[PDB]
Design a protein around this ligand. Structure first.
Ligand SMILES: CCCCCCCC/C=C\CCCCCCCC(=O)OC[C@H](O)CO
Ligand SMILES: CCCCCCCCCCCC[N+](C)(C)[O-]
Ligand SMILES: CCCCCCCCCCCC[N+](C)(C)[O-]
Ligand code: NA
Length: 429
């Protein structure tokens, strides 16, 4: 019971992925295994505490051993070292032990995973009581802290994140709240005539997300309520200066840039039936605006998101928009069916169906686990069936599977079916 100062996380991960590009580019296939050692240290002295977690990975190929990876001077190696988290924490600001201030590289996380779920350098203030939850923090990436990555993602470079939220429990297990997030770019874009690589930035933006959120045990997998729900509306405002480019002799040259106001809208609705103590089923609809006058309605998430939550009502967390498609709520429309089952804390299982549309036929969608160009004039992105099965021993064995059936929007020459699967075996000392 003595508060544990250190431990080690072991994970054997094998991943099957075929094919990310829908057979348009050479290779790009995964069918590889790896191990991921994560030692962690923790100290606590009254109101003060400190924590470090490192990461050692060795794999047969650049497989994904971390759902919070920065997606890829930016070519990762099959094996690498990494400092995932390092932070100091003070909790003596108030007598509420749910209140604390955390400084360093830390796990920023909100329940839906659509606003922030990542490890990033930040100073975050958390205030979590029964009646009132409030968070405030500032974050920015200065490095990946890994032996195989030299540079930041262009989007992370010189981007500062400020964010805050406040919510109350107006009814037992019913939460209403507001959430704000601001992303500011201090970087520069390539001047006209300049060669632009893959690590130059697409744009520089001053973006602000204004969110309403109503939840009723939306991500509480032990809900005593027969019905759980999540509902959120988010307004994205600000401006973007997008870099315009042109190709001269198989190399892209900067041609200028255009400024433009962003006035987008994002909605995510969900209802989960608690049929009995084991079986649960539910429905979701999430829409990210896209297109509009000069792209003004192109919604986009914060860049810190993971879009992974326990929306299926299980202890295991599932990607909100498919483990294969991994859609970002951007120019995106999603209808989601899911059934889930769980036996105490020994097992949980989830079967999730998705269908994806575009909002605008000439506008690309946000990030995804699919690297295939979209046909102009076509909304039908495709369908996806997911299956997550987990057995908890601390330790756990988990299969995450996504089967993506591309729609008409991907067109000729593309594979009729793409899958991404994982078998995660985790052990805690
Ligand atoms: C307890 C709830 C908290 C308060 C929340 C109240 C506001 C939303 C309530 C129901 C929305 C249900 C909408 C059902 C799904 C909509 C499907 C849809 O709209 O897709 C068509 C699209 O708009 C293009 O045609
Ligand atoms: C190889 C350098 C990093 C490894 C640091 C040590 C790993 C953590 C050791 C804790 C082992 C867990 N336990 C409970 C058995 O002590
Ligand atoms: C969902 C199951 C995950 C499949 C894991 C398969 C591991 C096979 C590892 C063999 C590595 C050989 N090679 C050339 C592919 O790196
Ligand atoms: Na406290």
């Amino acid at each position: 019971e003595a508060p544990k100062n250190f431990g080690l996380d072991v994970k054997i991960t094998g991943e099957s992925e075929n094919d990310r590009d829908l057979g348009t580019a050479p290779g790009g296939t995964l069918n590889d295994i790896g191990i991921d050692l994560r030692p962690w240290a923790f100290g606590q002295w009254g109101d003060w505490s400190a924590y470090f977690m490192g990461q050692a990975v060795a794999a047969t190929d650049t497989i994904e051993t971390d759902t919070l990876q920065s997606d890829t001077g930016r070519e990762p190696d099959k094996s690498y070292l990494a400092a995932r988290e390092f932070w100091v924490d003070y909790a003596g600001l108030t007598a509420y032990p749910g209140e604390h201030l955390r400084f360093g590289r830390q796990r920023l996380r909100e329940d839906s995973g659509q606003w922030q779920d990542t490890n990033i350098e930040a100073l975050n203030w958390s205030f979590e009581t029964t009646l009132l939850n409030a968070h405030a923090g500032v974050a920015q990436r200065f490095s990946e802290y890994r032996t195989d990555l030299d540079e930041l993602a262009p989007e992370d470079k010189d981007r500062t994140h400020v964010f805050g939220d406040i919510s109350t429990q107006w009814a037992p297990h019913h939460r209403i709240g507001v959430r704000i997030h601001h992303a500011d770019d201090s970087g520069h874009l390539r001047r006209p005539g300049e060669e632009v690589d893959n690590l130059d930035k697409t744009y520089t933006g001053q973006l602000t997300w204004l969110g309403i959120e109503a939840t009723g045990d939306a991500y509480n997998y032990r809900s005593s309520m027969p019905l759980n729900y999540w509902a959120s509306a988010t307004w994205l405002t600000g401006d973007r200066d997008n870099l315009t480019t042109t190709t001269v002799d198989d190399r892209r040259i900067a041609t200028g840039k255009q400024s433009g106001d962003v006035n987008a809208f994002g909605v995510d609705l969900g209802l989960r039936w608690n049929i009995d103590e084991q079986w649960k089923a539910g429905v979701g609809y999430a829409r990210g605006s896209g297109g509009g006058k000069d792209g003004e309605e192109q919604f986009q998430q914060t860049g810190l998101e993971s879009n992974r939550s326990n929306f299926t009502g299980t202890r295991s967390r599932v990607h909100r928009f498919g483990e294969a498609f991994r859609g970002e709520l951007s120019n995106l429309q999603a209808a989601t069916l899911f059934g889930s089952w769980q036996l105490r804390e020994d097992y949980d299982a989830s079967l999730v169906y998705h269908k994806f549309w575009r909002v605008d036929d000439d506008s690309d969608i946000g990030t995804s686990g699919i690297n295939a160009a979209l046909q102009p004039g076509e909304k039908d992105i495709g369908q996806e069936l997911d299956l997550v099965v987990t057995k908890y021993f601390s330790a756990l064995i988990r299969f995450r599977g996504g089967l993506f059936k591309p729609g008409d929007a991907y067109g000729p020459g593309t594979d009729s079916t793409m899958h991404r699967a994982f078998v995660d075996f985790i052990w805690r000392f």
